[PDB]
Amino acid sequence: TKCTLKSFTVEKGIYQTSNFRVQPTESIVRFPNITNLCPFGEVFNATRFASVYAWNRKRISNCVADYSVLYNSASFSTFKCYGVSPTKLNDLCFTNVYADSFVIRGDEVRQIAPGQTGKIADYNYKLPDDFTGCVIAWNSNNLDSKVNYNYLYRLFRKSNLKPFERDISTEIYQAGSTPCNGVEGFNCYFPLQSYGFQPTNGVGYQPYRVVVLSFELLHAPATVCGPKKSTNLVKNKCVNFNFNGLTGTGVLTESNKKFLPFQQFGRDIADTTDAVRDPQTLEILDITPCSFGGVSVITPGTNTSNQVAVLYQDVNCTEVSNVFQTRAGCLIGAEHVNNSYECDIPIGAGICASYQTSQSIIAYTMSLGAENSVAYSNNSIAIPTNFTISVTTEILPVSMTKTSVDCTMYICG
Amino acid sequence: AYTNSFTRGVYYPDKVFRSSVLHSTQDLFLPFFSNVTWFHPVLPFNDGVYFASTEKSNIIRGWIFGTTLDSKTQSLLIVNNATNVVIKVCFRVYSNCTFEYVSQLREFVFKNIDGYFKIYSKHTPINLVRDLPQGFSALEPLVDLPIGINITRFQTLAAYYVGYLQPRTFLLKYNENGTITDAVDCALDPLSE
Amino acid sequence: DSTECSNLLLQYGSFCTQLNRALTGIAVEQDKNTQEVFAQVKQIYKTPPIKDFGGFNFSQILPDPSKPSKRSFIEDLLFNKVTLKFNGLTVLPPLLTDEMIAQYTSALLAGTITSGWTFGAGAALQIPFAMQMAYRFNGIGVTQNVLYENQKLIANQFNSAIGKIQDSLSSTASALGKLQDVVNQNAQALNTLVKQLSSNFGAISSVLNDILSRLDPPEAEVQIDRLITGRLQSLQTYVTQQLIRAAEIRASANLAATKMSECVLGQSKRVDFCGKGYHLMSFPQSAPHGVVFLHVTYVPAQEKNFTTAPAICHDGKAHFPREGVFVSNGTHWFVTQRNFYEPQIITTDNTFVSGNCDVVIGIVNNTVYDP
Amino acid sequence: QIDRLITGRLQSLQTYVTQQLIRAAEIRASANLAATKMSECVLGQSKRVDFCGKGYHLMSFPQSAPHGVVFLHVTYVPAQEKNFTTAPAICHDGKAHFP
Amino acid sequence: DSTECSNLLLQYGSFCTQLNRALTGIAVEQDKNTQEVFAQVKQIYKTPP
Numbered sequence A: 001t002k003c004t005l006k007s008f009t010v011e012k013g014i015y016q017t018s019n020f021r022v023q024p025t026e027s028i029v030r031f032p033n034i035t036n037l038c039p040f041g042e043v044f045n046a047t048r049f050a051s052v053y054a055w056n057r058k059r060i061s062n063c064v065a066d067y068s069v070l071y072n073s074a075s076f077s078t079f080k081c082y083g084v085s086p087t088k089l090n091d092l093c094f095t096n097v098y099a100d101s102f103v104i105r106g107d108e109v110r111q112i113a114p115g116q117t118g119k120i121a122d123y124n125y126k127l128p129d130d131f132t133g134c135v136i137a138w139n140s141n142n143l144d145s146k147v148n149y150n151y152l153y154r155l156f157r158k159s160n161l162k163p164f165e166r167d168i169s170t171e172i173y174q175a176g177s178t179p180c181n182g183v184e185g186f187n188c189y190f191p192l193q194s195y196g197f198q199p200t201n202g203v204g205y206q207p208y209r210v211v212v213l214s215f216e217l218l219h220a221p222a223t224v225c226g227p228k229k230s231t232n233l234v235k236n237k238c239v240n241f242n243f244n245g246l247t248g249t250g251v252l253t254e255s256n257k258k259f260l261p262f263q264q265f266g267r268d269i270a271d272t273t274d275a276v277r278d279p280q281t282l283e284i285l286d287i288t289p290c291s292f293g294g295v296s297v298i299t300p301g302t303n304t305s306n307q308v309a310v311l312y313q314d315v316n317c318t319e320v321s322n323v324f325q326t327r328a329g330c331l332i333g334a335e336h337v338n339n340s341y342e343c344d345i346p347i348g349a350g351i352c353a354s355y356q357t358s359q360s361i362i363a364y365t366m367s368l369g370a371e372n373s374v375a376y377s378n379n380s381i382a383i384p385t386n387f388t389i390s391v392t393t394e395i396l397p398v399s400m401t402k403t404s405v406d407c408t409m410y411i412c413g
Numbered sequence B: 001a002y003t004n005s006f007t008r009g010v011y012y013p014d015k016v017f018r019s020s021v022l023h024s025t026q027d028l029f030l031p032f033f034s035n036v037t038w039f040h041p042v043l044p045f046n047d048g049v050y051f052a053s054t055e056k057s058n059i060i061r062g063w064i065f066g067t068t069l070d071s072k073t074q075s076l077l078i079v080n081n082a083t084n085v086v087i088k089v090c091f092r093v094y095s096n097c098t099f100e101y102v103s104q105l106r107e108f109v110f111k112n113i114d115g116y117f118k119i120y121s122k123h124t125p126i127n128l129v130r131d132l133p134q135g136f137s138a139l140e141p142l143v144d145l146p147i148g149i150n151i152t153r154f155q156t157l158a159a160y161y162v163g164y165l166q167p168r169t170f171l172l173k174y175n176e177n178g179t180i181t182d183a184v185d186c187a188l189d190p191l192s193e
Numbered sequence C: 001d002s003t004e005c006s007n008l009l010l011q012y013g014s015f016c017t018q019l020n021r022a023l024t025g026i027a028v029e030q031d032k033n034t035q036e037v038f039a040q041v042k043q044i045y046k047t048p049p050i051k052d053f054g055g056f057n058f059s060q061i062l063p064d065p066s067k068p069s070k071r072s073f074i075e076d077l078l079f080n081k082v083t084l085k086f087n088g089l090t091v092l093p094p095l096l097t098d099e100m101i102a103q104y105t106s107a108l109l110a111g112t113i114t115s116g117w118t119f120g121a122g123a124a125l126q127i128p129f130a131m132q133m134a135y136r137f138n139g140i141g142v143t144q145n146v147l148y149e150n151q152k153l154i155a156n157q158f159n160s161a162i163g164k165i166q167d168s169l170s171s172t173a174s175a176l177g178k179l180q181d182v183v184n185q186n187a188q189a190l191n192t193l194v195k196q197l198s199s200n201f202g203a204i205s206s207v208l209n210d211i212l213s214r215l216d217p218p219e220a221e222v223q224i225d226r227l228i229t230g231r232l233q234s235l236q237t238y239v240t241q242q243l244i245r246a247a248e249i250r251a252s253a254n255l256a257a258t259k260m261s262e263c264v265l266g267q268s269k270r271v272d273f274c275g276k277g278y279h280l281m282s283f284p285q286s287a288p289h290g291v292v293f294l295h296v297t298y299v300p301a302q303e304k305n306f307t308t309a310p311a312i313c314h315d316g317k318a319h320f321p322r323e324g325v326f327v328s329n330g331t332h333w334f335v336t337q338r339n340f341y342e343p344q345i346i347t348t349d350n351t352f353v354s355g356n357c358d359v360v361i362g363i364v365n366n367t368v369y370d371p
Numbered sequence D: 001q002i003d004r005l006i007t008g009r010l011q012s013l014q015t016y017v018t019q020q021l022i023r024a025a026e027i028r029a030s031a032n033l034a035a036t037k038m039s040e041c042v043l044g045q046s047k048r049v050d051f052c053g054k055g056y057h058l059m060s061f062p063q064s065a066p067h068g069v070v071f072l073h074v075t076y077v078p079a080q081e082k083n084f085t086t087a088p089a090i091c092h093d094g095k096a097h098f099p
Numbered sequence E: 001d002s003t004e005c006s007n008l009l010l011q012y013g014s015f016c017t018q019l020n021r022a023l024t025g026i027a028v029e030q031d032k033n034t035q036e037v038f039a040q041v042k043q044i045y046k047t048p049p
């Protein structure tokens, strides 16, 4: 109070020294059950894959994708992502998600990347230069090699494939001047070969299953978003909370108000969130702003003593010598008395505090005045037999200081 | 064969809940006392549309929404069926599938906002036939699909009223429960103004 | 509770200590208003156990112990007539509780009933209520015998007049217009102040966490600055509205204090200050945010035409009325008090003699009986 | 930069002059009350109760203060009351006598 | 009477409504002032001819 009054001596009175707000603890977040999940399982654990010339594309839509299952798995040889962070898209959404799966061999996995050339990159599967997505591959010798699957790849093509183009035509490739008649011959070759996936092949010659996730993020609606962590709730404790994207700080409590089956969160008046239903358990809670109020000291004046009695306004002080609850707040450091005296320092709610003897600050319900019942009767009169003349002082302000402010010299100078 | 749209034809604007308070909402609504075109075919979709139908034998089936409906561009094809209601972006009536959804007076409100299709429905114990009595009801049981096209056709496959929503503010009174007991139309009348 | 906004606000200056100082000033001014209006009684006066106030009936305006609030019937009616913690807004409770104000008014009412106006001057000196009403009739110009001869009728009129107030308050709606208007104005101000938060104020979004989240701090600073300046402007507007309205209510509270003093504590000769008609007495009742005065006034009725004369010319000298007015019913001349027709024989005792006949114009010959 | 400074200093000067106007209105109310007291309590004797001191007003004197005025109100306060039996009238010879 | 300005003004909030309400309050107060000062007589009185 000496600080906020800019003095080393403060007079007898009650001064609002500061404000006090209970700080929130253990913030909580909640989001509805993850009932619908994205079909990455039927893409990655598909019993049969597809030849690289006829690569399979799976469109991912209207689902929540938990990409952590992909990068937390320890059964991948390569997980190269371009222009996107797989560890950072579990709180991200995409306007479009594609999943391309096929089978190649070891030394050809390096071709599934932007700006590559070769049999696979030019005639089977081409990625764009500005590719945004991940290239995931793993050895599949235990599945695609026996001593009965038949995987194919394209040998020739009259022009290189555009990015994400797919050619499945089995027409005879014309390499020379003479035109083939849909039949193989001189300067005429069938465009597809089979892979020679033998279990005893070298590592670079064994089959590798490849999945290519590609993403798009335009200023357009999105339907593929990852999962959202959720935690348990609390009661009667000022907490920062996140309910279905709505952030707020308060004490959550049980509420008798019933929502309607469609209403999520409610506002009593003045566009202030007052109730909210949790998405998991489908239960309504009332939000109350956790206790806050001005803290004001009561001091009898410095020269009298240095004692003070703190008053935390409108705070039921179950929380931070003798702690006395009053209808104007909580009083810390002031003894409560039963008798009543004339009001000295106005606390509020019909309660005043004063410094009196040993030498303590006492709070009491102020006395309106002395009580007397003047003796009325239908035939009794009280006549004055004497008098006192009395001079009293009435003080009245009549004027102020005639201040004049030069606008320009004050503003600019 | 027009017929004035009465008070009926108002829906819950958003998900929020309001108890015993009056609110003002600014979005598409069906005007009070606006002569809807009772049909007894072909219907446009300039904007969101209030569709209200009465069938003793439930003859009417789902709505075939379409921007062009020439098989060139994707349709919406709401249909309904004893077991379930099926809606696909792609039976007897026909004309690159993007999305399919299957789930479970007769007020119906359909609108497309920023590519999101919204449906509002209500069931009423009608006692007078061939007139929709002025009364109040609304709900928001909906299915949202991000089409992003401007539908222009209905082709509903035994008479149905059809009215067109307009962007005019309303004042909705809210019950203690949170339901919309009543509403008034701001620009309808100077008294309502 | 946003730290970066806290810093950007800090750099503006001492605006908020100033706003807080203005608001706390009007806050303590309100307590001063209530205490000044009601705390004009030195010591609370208990009313006697048995009510025999000369036929007058004060049961309605006197406190009833049966009620838990311990306030009078009309005060509870007035309380029922009116119909009276979100983000940084707090409403401090008034220093004087409603029960304390009811006790103040009960003390004032018991004092004015039992002791008349003596208790305001000093020690409470008790007079029988009939004799005090006679004092007050002498105050308004009517002689005191008029009350005693008509005491039962006056008691019945006062009782029925108090009864009419109960009907007027209970049935007629919007009787407490001014007080309800005060409550509505304060609710309106707080409500619009809270509504201003949703306003965009020219930034990309109103909600501050969102504007913080999806922009870099250098760019977000500008949008946050727009939000801060708009919200600070709205809060400054609310504070200045409160200051002006508090000035107006202070004027009304000073008027209530003056009426409490000049009408409850004492009889006032200022015409139309307290009621319509010559003022007899007034009683205070505690409304929720104000005081309701019941003004007991004396209004004359059933007037009669008379022929009057300025002076009576008898035996060559002019007799003027001491306190009355000469009136003639057609053949005889009488002296009557102006406010109440009570004729008396013209005598030298009640008519003083000055001058002679010729000077004064309009005088009429008659005989002044000499006792 | 000067624009920001101008706006801030202008807002401060504006709120200062508004608070000065309100304080001046309060002081004008007080000065009108003081003029009424000086006219009704010094230039004469006032019957309106508790306007000038507690008790029946005899007279009053003004004294100059730095920014105001201090009235010394001389009032008559009855004291040493005595009980008596009382009656409104007196019956004598079949006539009522009132004081 | 420019829509582009009015749409920007909508963002500021209820300032115009507040100003209109304050001014209309002053307006009705002026009628109240004249009524309180001059309408002290119940019924119009005519001086005798």
Ligand SMILES: *[C@@]1(O)O[C@H](CO)[C@]2(O[C@@]3(O[C@H](CO)[C@@]4(O[C@]5(O[C@H](CO)[C@@H](O)[C@]6(O[C@@]7(O[C@H](CO)[C@@H](O)[C@H](O)[C@@H]7O)O6)[C@@H]5O)O4)[C@H](O)[C@H]3NC(C)=O)O2)[C@H](O)[C@H]1NC(C)=O
Pocket: A385, A386, A387, D080
């Ligand atoms: C009227 O109603 O009230 C006034 C009050 O001012 C009253 O006048 C007071 O009378 C007192 C009684 O005589 C007076 O007290 C004494 O004064 C003499 C001086 O004349 C003084 O020597 C006296 O003290 C001695 O006696 C007392 C008591 O025995 C004792 O305690 C002392 O130690 C000392 O031995 O002292 C008294 O003080 O008292 C007051 O001076 C006097 N006041 C004034 C201002 O003159 O006046 C009226 O008598 C009274 N009238 C009626 C009809 O009741």
Ligand SMILES: *[C@@]1(O)O[C@H](CO)[C@]2(O[C@@]3(O[C@H](CO)[C@@]4(O[C@]5(O[C@H](CO)[C@@H](O)[C@]6(O[C@@]7(O[C@H](CO)[C@@H](O)[C@H](O)[C@@H]7O)O6)[C@@H]5O)O4)[C@H](O)[C@H]3NC(C)=O)O2)[C@H](O)[C@H]1NC(C)=O
Pocket: C313, C364, C365, C366
């Ligand atoms: C009031 O109640 O009493 C007085 C007192 O008597 C009354 O005054 C009287 O007024 C008369 C009208 O002026 C007065 O009559 C004349 O006075 C003059 C003045 O001396 C006198 O010369 C006059 O007589 C002549 O004229 C009359 C006709 O007027 C004629 O018959 C005579 O024979 C003669 O030729 O005489 C009148 O006497 O009349 C009275 O003298 C005068 N009385 C006195 C004592 O001065 O004053 C008032 O008239 C009367 N007012 C009312 C309303 O009754």
Ligand SMILES: CC(=O)N[C@@H]1[C@@H](O)[C@H](O[C@]2(O)O[C@H](CO)[C@]3(O[C@@]4(O[C@H](CO)[C@@H](O)[C@H](O)[C@@H]4O)O3)[C@H](O)[C@H]2NC(C)=O)[C@@H](CO)O[C@H]1O
Pocket: C303, C304, C305, C306
């Ligand atoms: C207490 C008492 O008896 N006072 C009377 C007083 O009433 C009376 O003056 C009227 O009282 O004034 C009215 C004016 O409204 C007056 O009446 C007129 O009547 C004619 C037709 O008769 C109408 O055409 C006029 O428009 C007007 O209404 O009535 C007339 O002067 C009085 N009315 C009465 C007596 O009924 C005065 C008269 O001098 O006498 C007082 O003693």
Ligand SMILES: CC(=O)N[C@H]1[C@H](O)O[C@H](CO)[C@]2(O[C@@]3(O[C@H](CO)[C@]4(O[C@@]5(O[C@H](CO)[C@@H](O)[C@H](O)[C@@H]5O)O4)[C@H](O)[C@H]3NC(C)=O)O2)[C@@H]1O
Pocket: A256, A257, A258, B176, B177, B178
């Ligand atoms: C949660 C809540 O209060 N919901 C309220 C809903 O929003 O509004 C309706 C209608 O205004 C409200 O319904 C009525 O509530 C009362 C009290 O809860 C209900 O009163 C009881 O009814 C039961 C049987 O239902 C009796 O056994 C009991 O004695 C009470 O009489 O009163 C009343 O029945 C409800 N009306 C119904 C169910 O139609 O509904 C509802 O509270």
Ligand SMILES: *[C@@]1(O)O[C@H](CO)[C@]2(O[C@@]3(O[C@H](CO)[C@@H](O)[C@H](O)[C@H]3NC(C)=O)O2)[C@H](O)[C@H]1NC(C)=O
Pocket: A337, A338, A339
């Ligand atoms: C205080 O002045 O008055 C209290 C009145 O309630 C007093 O509290 C009571 O004290 C008695 C005796 O100790 C107990 O039997 C009661 O249970 C108790 N009641 C309550 C509500 O606390 O309290 C209190 O003792 C008294 N204190 C003093 C110092 O006089």
Ligand SMILES: CC(=O)N[C@H]1[C@H](O)O[C@H](CO)[C@]2(O[C@@]3(O[C@H](CO)[C@@H](O)[C@H](O)[C@H]3NC(C)=O)O2)[C@@H]1O
Pocket: A032, A033, A034, A035, A279, A280, A281
């Ligand atoms: C909307 C929804 O599906 N909510 C369920 C959520 O997804 O999963 C929890 C987990 O079981 C679910 O909680 C169960 O709810 C039922 C409803 O009455 C209770 O009977 C169960 O006890 C409860 N079980 C648990 C573990 O919470 O919760 C939600 O219903």
Ligand SMILES: CC(=O)N[C@H]1[C@H](O)O[C@H](CO)[C@]2(O[C@@]3(O[C@H](CO)[C@@H](O)[C@H](O)[C@H]3NC(C)=O)O2)[C@@H]1O
Pocket: A377, A378, A379
């Ligand atoms: C002038 C007057 O009314 N005097 C009455 C006084 O005010 O009250 C007493 C009360 O005792 C009154 O005298 C009577 O007292 C008996 C006592 O039992 C009552 O029963 C009588 O009702 C009462 N008389 C009246 C008229 O009330 O004395 C005085 O009369």
Ligand SMILES: CC(=O)N[C@H]1[C@H](O)O[C@H](CO)[C@]2(O[C@@]3(O[C@H](CO)[C@@H](O)[C@H](O)[C@H]3NC(C)=O)O2)[C@@H]1O
Pocket: B081, B082, B083, B084, B086, B102
């Ligand atoms: C009489 C009947 O049930 N008719 C069809 C009903 O209206 O809709 C469902 C759509 O789900 C229909 O069944 C589907 O038939 C196709 C074709 O064989 C199957 O691929 C779907 O799995 C199957 N769906 C369901 C839910 O059964 O059935 C009915 O034919």
Ligand SMILES: CC(=O)N[C@H]1[C@H](O)O[C@H](CO)[C@]2(O[C@@]3(O[C@H](CO)[C@@H](O)[C@H](O)[C@H]3NC(C)=O)O2)[C@@H]1O
Pocket: C056, C057, C058, C059, C060
């Ligand atoms: C002495 C006396 O009779 N005082 C009455 C007082 O002046 O008015 C109240 C209110 O009417 C009066 O109390 C009511 O009296 C009637 C009898 O006519 C009873 O029926 C009522 O119950 C009673 N109370 C109320 C609240 O009306 O009280 C006093 O009698």
Ligand SMILES: CC(=O)N[C@H]1[C@H](O)O[C@H](CO)[C@]2(O[C@@]3(O[C@H](CO)[C@@H](O)[C@H](O)[C@H]3NC(C)=O)O2)[C@@H]1O
Pocket: C328, C329, C330, C331, C332
């Ligand atoms: C026109 C008229 O009747 N005037 C009367 C006047 O207004 O009052 C007096 C005094 O009462 C009145 O005269 C008295 O009337 C009473 C009526 O009861 C008679 O008993 C008296 O005899 C009569 N005369 C007197 C008292 O001298 O006169 C007028 O009649």
Ligand SMILES: CC(=O)N[C@H]1[C@H](O)O[C@H](CO)[C@]2(O[C@@]3(O[C@H](CO)[C@@H](O)[C@H](O)[C@H]3NC(C)=O)O2)[C@@H]1O
Pocket: A373, A374, A375, A382, D081, D082, D083, D084
């Ligand atoms: C000035 C004076 O002496 N007044 C008294 C008055 O004349 O009589 C009444 C009743 O006798 C009196 O009031 C009672 O006085 C005694 C003794 O002082 C007290 O004990 C009583 O409490 C008091 N009140 C009663 C009896 O109701 O009152 C006056 O003091």
Ligand SMILES: *[C@@]1(O)O[C@H](CO)[C@@H](O)[C@H](O)[C@H]1NC(C)=O
Pocket: A302, A303, A304
């Ligand atoms: C003040 O409270 O204490 C001073 C000693 O520190 C003392 O000199 C001074 O008189 C005191 N003031 C009052 C008003 O008593």
Ligand SMILES: *[C@@]1(O)O[C@H](CO)[C@@H](O)[C@H](O)[C@H]1NC(C)=O
Pocket: A316, A317, A318, A325
């Ligand atoms: C207090 O605020 O909280 C206690 C536990 O939460 C409760 O028992 C007590 O009654 C409350 N008191 C008040 C005055 O609110």
Ligand SMILES: CC(=O)N[C@@H]1[C@@H](O)[C@H](O)[C@@H](CO)O[C@H]1O
Pocket: A039, A040, A041, A042, A043, A044, A045, A046, A069, A073
């Ligand atoms: C091996 C198995 O049983 N299931 C796999 C799972 O391990 C893998 O995480 C998932 C990827 O979507 O693909 C499934 O087929």
Ligand SMILES: CC(=O)N[C@@H]1[C@@H](O)[C@H](O)[C@@H](CO)O[C@H]1O
Pocket: A059, B096, B097, B098
């Ligand atoms: C020719 C044509 O429109 N092809 C579209 C393609 O553009 C779109 O990206 C894809 C989304 O599933 O659906 C195809 O039918």
